[PDB]
Design the sequence.
């Protein structure tokens, strides 16, 4: 049985991603967020509710990525160096999830926090989107998986990392770009820096597996990937309408969702599917 | 679908272990090992071979713990806070495994290193040992597992963390306790500090599951646990004979194996099975 041997490279990129993961290491103890209270109280109830809801959805996605997406993909990866990288990325998803709780403690009472988590758990669109992604991961709960199964789990993972988070990341960025909730915005920017490299890395792994598939299996997963993108898009457009109508930001968020969907496709080596639109300037300032 | 909510505790211990994991965080770039060369070259040929072999075995066990033992246990936990802890511990096993490569780079040429990793992969006792442990993990590659299956994976994990590493840790500690290879000894001490908390934590999780089993199932896993302890012990005694005969340390290492096997049993809430003996005094100085 083989041990990981970093003296013999298994590929030309895992070491650089291993080093970058670690270089980016952080935890929530490093950024106090109590100073956000002064701008928190300047927001309206509708703005505060939207913020708490999107953070709840982000927490759900990181929970599933650390607890299912990274572990089940990594278990089935043959390359032991890449497996190492994925294990570290999965741990960072748990750091991210804990950091949202750190934000919640400043912005809400204990009872309000538990209400948000009940809202997350019962939410039909969050349940639907998380169910679609995790169905691909749960197919990997078997002793041996096919390359098509592993590829589609990696596609789902890239779509989570590079696309599904972004309807949620929009609002912290938008507020931080206006000087509001800037400490929480700093945390969100650290999370985004991690998710960006997660999506690039899993996308490299997916492209490698795809190229190993038979032509018939390639045609199958190509179609399934395009369908999945648009199945998720219909749900995202319902989610943004629900969350952002009250505060007038629906079309802005939808543009940002499309921009990030295109990045997820490019991380998979695939062509963009949405028209190019320039990033919202306030969001850009929040980044 | 539930998101992890650190505002509502799921148990009385996961937060403290989460915090301690992070408090103990390190990576190999923090300890340069080049200064060990002066004492390395003073070892005999036989001492150098034993050292490289035990490091290879340690690398294998960390490889399997980070890539199978932590991920497959964690996926099947219902407690999302405990899941988070296990994900971080699994990442640390990959840090540990990479740190052995960092030691190898100072102590051996590129060709000598690849020889050690080939020796690891083809070794019959390492294959048997790793096969026994990982069989319990691989039983979890299915959507629904029983509590007996999850409990026995946790037992196997505690035995790896608290017991199977120690026939290998002995030698870096024994040399460091004499002023030899002290920088590599510092790394091994950091690894041990991590494995010690890993074994305690997994053992707490195992005791929780055990308390939910029927009396019939409890009797069945108690029998499996005692048999596994002794199945591993027979292999460990063959392994110590093979590695340490040439340097006259077999009985010393065996005493250390038994001491650590007792600690693994205690981490599971079980009585010791080996007579109490004091730890080798040089090993104690190396700690
Ligand atoms: Fe994350
Ligand atoms: Fe991520
Ligand atoms: Fe380890
Ligand atoms: Fe460990």
Sequence:
């Amino acid at each position: 049985m083989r041990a990981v041997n970093w003296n013999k490279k298994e590929d030309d990129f895992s070491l650089m991603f291993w080093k970058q993961n670690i270089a980016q290491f952080w935890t929530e103890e490093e950024i106090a967020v109590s100073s956000d209270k002064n701008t928190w109280v300047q927001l309206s109830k509708e703005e505060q509710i939207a913020y708490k809801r999107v953070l709840g959805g982000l927490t759900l996605l990181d929970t599933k990525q650390g607890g299912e997406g990274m572990p089940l993909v990594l278990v089935h990866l043959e390359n032991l160096q890449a497996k190492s990288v994925l294990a570290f990325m999965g741990a960072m998803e748990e750091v991210h999830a804990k950091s949202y709780s750190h934000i919640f403690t400043t912005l809400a009472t204990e009872e309000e926090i538990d209400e948000i988590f009940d809202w997350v758990d019962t939410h039909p669109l969050l349940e639907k989107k998380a169910g679609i992604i995790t169905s691909y991961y749960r197919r990997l709960l078997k002793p041996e998986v096919t390359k098509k199964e592993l590829y589609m789990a990696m596609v789902a993972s890239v779509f989570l990392e590079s696309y599904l988070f972004y309807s949620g990341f929009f609002y912290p960025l938008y507020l931080a770009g206006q000087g509001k909730l800037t400490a929480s915005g700093e945390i969100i920017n650290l999370i985004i820096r991690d998710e960006s490299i997660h999506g690039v890395f899993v996308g490299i792994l997916a492209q490698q597996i795809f190229a190993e598939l038979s032509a018939e299996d390639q045609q199958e997963v190509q179609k399934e990937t395009q369908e999945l993108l648009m199945e998720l898009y219909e749900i995202e457009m319902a989610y943004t309408e629900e969350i952002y109508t009250s505060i007038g930001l629906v079309e802005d968020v939808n543009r940002f969702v499309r921009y990030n969907a295109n990045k997820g496709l490019m991380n998979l080596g695939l062509e963009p599917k949405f028209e190019e639109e320039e990033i919202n300037p306030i969001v850009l300032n929040g980044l």
User: Anything to note?
Assistant: The domain at 1-287 of chain A is CATH 1.10.620.20 (Ribonucleotide Reductase, subunit A). Chain A touches chain B through 57 residues (CB under 8 Å). Chain A has twelve helices and no strands.
